[PDB]
């Protein structure tokens, strides 16, 4: 099949590649006993203004994003840099939960690299944002007859907000030549403006509660998804998932001693040569499973069809046998 010809002339042909196939799989997450408080950020009576968006830090807990993904209440859930379905497994060294309220048409403005008043002066995401944005209409909570003016937004920002920057300044915006000295008037406008949320407004002006989950993926994982830690296996070609780092290799005891802070070590190859097991601070080295090139040595098919094989750069273990250099 390799030569693509029925007749094979005398010689050695590197027909195939021999890969030791792992049989067992090991999943070890941090042994942390707590549930991350998603409800507090989400199930909150009142949200902060977009210009002063609130930020919660989630750490030292076990997160479960399955509930959030499965929930149908969220009007729009868009994840950039991560799969909402696969969120269940990924660990995170740090989680930020930003919360605020905008109007429906501004929901799009909350996206990586987006523009507009909200994105430019209220809340800007980085180009390499790695997280999710979940927005849901709050017309039954953030709108009153006569206009709910509790929520505000920055309109005239002299300096464009940098990513993950919050500007609560209330300095009168001087849009003219003469200064204002804190005095409003013409060419001197208050930087903030209020949404008069009313239940009769169109969906474009209707209120929407927006939660941005920003993940840091790298360091020890303060937050990990729900999973069942399993017993590790030494000296066996197995799949492994250490703290969310996925790999396939032999997990062996390592004489080399990491520094107390050090968790994941990589050599010039930059591969995760060794790992630190979360359950026990035991440094486990990783070696690629024996791989080689199966070279078929065949005399010409005319002479005979008996064929020898040569596994390259492997011992006669993983495979009338001859061990040569």
């Amino acid at each position, epitope marked *: 099949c390799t030569l693509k010809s029925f007749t094979v002339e005398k010689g050695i042909y590197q027909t195939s590649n021999f890969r030791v196939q792992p049989t067992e799989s090991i999943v070890r997450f941090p042994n942390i006993t707590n549930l991350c*408080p998603f*409800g*507090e950020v*989400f*199930n*909150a*009576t*009142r949200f902060a203004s977009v210009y002063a968006w609130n930020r919660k830090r989630i750490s030292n807990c076990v997160a479960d994003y399955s509930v959030l993904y499965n929930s149908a*209440s969220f009007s729009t859930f868009k994840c950039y840099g991560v799969s909402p379905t696969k969120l269940n497994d990924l660990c995170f060294t740090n989680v930020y939960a930003d919360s605020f309220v905008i109007r429906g048409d501004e929901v799009r403005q909350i996206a990586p690299g987006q523009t507009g008043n909200i994105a430019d002066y209220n809340y800007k995401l980085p180009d390499d944002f790695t997280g999710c944005v979940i927005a*849901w*209409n*709050s*017309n*039954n*909570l*953030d*709108s*009153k*007859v*006569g206009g*709910n003016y*509790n929520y505000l937004y920055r309109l005239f920002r002299k300096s464009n907000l940098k990513p993950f920057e919050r500007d609560i300044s209330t300095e009168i915006y001087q849009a003219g030549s003469t200064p204002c000295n804190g005095v409003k008037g013409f060419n001197c406008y208050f930087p903030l403006q209020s949404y008069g949320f009313q*239940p*009769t407004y169109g969906v474009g002006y209707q209120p929407y*509660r927006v939660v941005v989950l920003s993940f840091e993926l790298l360091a020890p994982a303060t937050v990990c998804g729900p999973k069942k830690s399993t017993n590790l296996v030494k000296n066996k070609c197995v799949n492994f998932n250490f703290n969310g780092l996925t790999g396939t290799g032999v997990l062996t005891e390592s004489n080399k001693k990491f520094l107390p802070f050090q968790q994941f070590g990589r050599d010039i190859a930059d591969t995760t040569d060794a790992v630190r097991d979360p359950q026990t601070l035991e440094i486990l080295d990783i070696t690629p499973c024996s791989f080689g090139g199966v070279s078929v040595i065949t005399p010409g098919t005319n002479t005979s069809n008996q064929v020898a094989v040569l596994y390259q750069g492997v011992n006669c273990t993983e495979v009338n046998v001859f061990q040569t250099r």
Partner: antibody, heavy 119, light 109 residues
Framework: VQLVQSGAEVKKPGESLRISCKGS????????ISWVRQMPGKGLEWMGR????????NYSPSFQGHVTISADKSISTAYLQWSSLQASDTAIYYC??????????????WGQGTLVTVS | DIQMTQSPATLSVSPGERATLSCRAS??????LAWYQQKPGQAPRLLIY???TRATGIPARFSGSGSGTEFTLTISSLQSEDFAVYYC??????????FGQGTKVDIKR
């Protein structure tokens, strides 16, 4: 989900008083515990509400400068306090809860009420 | 504030019939209304919330409807334990929660 109020109180006019109502089993630290008055033969009348996490009051206009509503989230308790009691304050006071369900609100439990007699 | 007015003041319905109560608000309240039941000597009990959703654990004979300023509570097949005073309370989030005066349900005769 459970709210427990204090026992019935009897006070002379002008005496300060504070009734308590402890909550448990709440969806999140940001809920709405509210007080309602009920005179012997009158109907239901809202007084105010708090979110213990924020401790943000929304006193009713008819009860703004008459009572003070406070909260302690460490014990998940709400308190309704009269600085100076009067005979008109004699009534049954209930504490109700209003949890948040993302899309909308939901009142789950209603307090048994505490009878206050100013005389 | 948003004044809530109920009707009728009192009614009289035989068991098995359908009782109807109306509730009106001064200005709209969207659908943030709740109906309660307060039997003599008992604390108020929620029946309907959101002006249409039946509270869990309540008999299905109770139903709510309406929107805006006008809402209605219907008790089909009135029972012998349904005699109480029913109020309608609005709970708009950024607003003072107002209460109606209530309506009394008694035996027809």
């Amino acid at each position: 989900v459970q709210l427990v109020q204090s026992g019935a109180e009897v006070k002379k006019p002008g005496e300060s008083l504070r009734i308590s109502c402890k909550g448990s089993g709440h969806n999140s630290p940001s809920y709405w515990i509210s007080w309602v008055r009920q005179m012997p033969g009158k109907g239901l009348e809202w007084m105010g509400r708090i979110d213990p996490s924020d401790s943000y009051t929304n006193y009713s206009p008819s009860f703004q400068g008459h009572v003070t509503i406070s909260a302690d989230k460490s014990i998940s308790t709400a308190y309704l306090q009269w600085s100076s009691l009067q005979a008109s304050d004699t009534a049954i006071y209930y504490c109700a809860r209003h949890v948040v369900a993302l899309t909308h609100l939901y009142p789950d439990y209603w307090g048994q009420g505490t009878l206050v007699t100013v005389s | 504030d948003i004044q809530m007015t109920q009707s009728p003041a009192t009614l009289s319905v035989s068991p098995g019939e359908r009782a109807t109560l109306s509730c009106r608000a001064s200005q709209s309240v969207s659908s943030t209304l709740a109906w309660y039941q307060q039997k003599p000597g008992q604390a108020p009990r929620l029946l309907i919330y959101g002006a249409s959703t039946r509270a869990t654990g309540i008999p299905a004979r109770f139903s709510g409807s309406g929107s805006g300023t006008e809402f209605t509570l219907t008790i089909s097949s009135l029972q012998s334990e349904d005699f109480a005073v029913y109020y309608c309370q609005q709970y708009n989030n950024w607003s003072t929660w107002t209460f109606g005066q209530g309506t009394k349900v008694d035996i027809k005769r």
